[PDB]
């Protein structure tokens, strides 16, 4: 369980922290990170939720990020990744890929 998530993080620099239900639907807390660097190397992290009510909702998690963190993220990721989005679940890997590449800038 925990070791499985550890494996996916090593392999893909993404982590599903938690899944939970609310009146709106079924949701997952996600973080994606820059690929491993050195001690002096940059490390960026994007947090977002994925929701299911086939379409998936992408909701970026930004409110507790510092001004400097958000500025840096907005310099690397395209502007639409800071908005709530709805798209086919079959397209989700495209957004994983785009976020992963963007964070490596």
């Amino acid at each position: 369980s925990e070791v499985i998530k550890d494996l996916y993080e090593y392999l893909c620099n993404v982590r599903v922290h938690k899944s939970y239900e609310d009146d709106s639907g079924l949701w997952f807390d996600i973080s994606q990170g820059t690929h491993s660097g050195g001690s002096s190397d940059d490390y960026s992290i994007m947090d977002y939720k994925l929701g299911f009510v086939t379409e998936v909702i992408y909701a970026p998690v930004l409110k507790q990020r510092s001004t400097e963190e958000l500025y840096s993220l907005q310099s690397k990721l395209p502007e639409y990744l800071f908005e709530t989005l709805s798209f086919p679940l079959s397209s989700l890997n495209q957004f994983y890929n785009k976020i992963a590449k963007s964070l490596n800038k």
């Binding site: 993080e9 982590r15 922290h17 994606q32 990170g33 490390y43 992290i45 947090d47 998690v61």
Partner: peptide, 17 residues
């Protein structure tokens, strides 16, 4: 070292609000 696993430890209420 799993940076994302420990990320939530630096901001524990990140996803709460």
């Amino acid at each position: 070292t799993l940076k994302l696993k420990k990320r939530l430890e630096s901001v524990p209420e990140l996803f709460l609000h």
